[PDB]
Each structure stands twice: as C-alpha cells, then as structure tokens.
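Reproducibility note. Readers wishing to regenerate the assembly model reported in the main text can use the exact inputs given here. Chain order matters: entities are listed in the order in which they were concatenated for prediction.
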Amino acid sequence: AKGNFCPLCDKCYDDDDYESKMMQCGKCDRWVHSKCENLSDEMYEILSNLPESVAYTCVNCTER
Amino acid sequence: AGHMATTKRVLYVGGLAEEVDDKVLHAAFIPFGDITDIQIPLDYETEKHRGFAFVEFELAEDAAAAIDNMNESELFGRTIRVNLAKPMRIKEGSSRPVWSDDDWLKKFSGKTLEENK
Ligand SMILES: [Zn+2]
Ligand SMILES: [Zn+2]
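Running the prediction on these inputs yields the following structure tokens for the assembly.
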C-alpha cells in the first residue's frame, strides 16, 4: 500500500478539499488532490469528467 | 497549415497506438518548444488508452506549432491527429460535458446522449 490518501503531499482529508480539486479513483476508493498531480484546473475537469470506461487513475492503480 | 485559435493551454492528441506513453508523446512534441505536462487516461479493464491523450506546453506559440506539424506526424506505424483543447473547458457546477469537443469524448464512450438526464 501507499496510504489511503494523496502520497504526493503532507495534506490530508481536511475541510480545504473544495478548492484542492479532489478526485476519486475508478478502481479503488482512494481520493487524491489534483493539484499535487501537477494537473491544470481544466485538465483536471476533463480527466475527471471522462467516461466510465476510460479515465485517469491513482498512483497505485497506474504509474505516472 | 492553420488553426481556429492560437491558445495557451492544453491540446488534444489522437490516432495513437496503445504502446504510446508520455515518453513517446514527450519526445515527439518537445522539438517545437518546452512541454510542462502530459497524461494518458486508461481503460479500466486493460490499462490501455483508446488512442487518445493530452499534452500541455510551457509556451503558447509552440503549442500552435504542434497542431500545425504533428497533425501530419506518424507514430508506431500509423498516422496521428493533433488539435486545440481549450474551447472545451467543462461547465462543472452546472452540467456535464455535452456541448463541445468534450461531447465527442462522450460519443466516444458510446453515444450516451440517448440516456443523458
Ligand atoms: Zn495532495
Ligand atoms: Zn486507485
């Protein structure tokens, strides 16, 4: 495992998650901040609203 | 060559083989100018992309050179396609993507608009 939280920073499930542009993985339930993934805001909205067949995954469901 | 707008944000890529990864998109897109981000979405059962991906430049002019030259480029033995991806900023907080290049991403999932609600 690599923790049930964003491993790319020391932040956690805190109340600030609204502007942290968080996203849930699609084959595991871990949540991650998209800002730590170096993703732009529009880039985030696209890969977050991609179809249910194809989409981006967390650092343990795929290497990035 | 030509384009609908120069833009300064991320751009679209397609016609890729499943063997393509960010290291292939970086080496093929870096000669026009500096890149700052590349990501490939994947299919949940095979961990492969359907031949579509995204790229982001550090400069707005070099992104216009990508759509002007890489749209005729070739990778893995097949032709690729490149175009802008700024005129598709999602209307999150009001509706899902159904009105732009993001709509054809839904048509790509398999029509889907016959059940949109
Ligand atoms: Zn984080
Ligand atoms: Zn995951």
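We highlight two features of this model. Residues 11-86 of chain B form a domain with the Alpha-Beta Plaits fold (CATH 3.30.70.330). The interface with chain A takes residues 9-10, 37, 39, 41-44, 47, 49-50, 54, 56, 85-86, 88-90, 92, 96-97, 102, 105-106, 108-110, 112 of chain B (CB under 8 Å).
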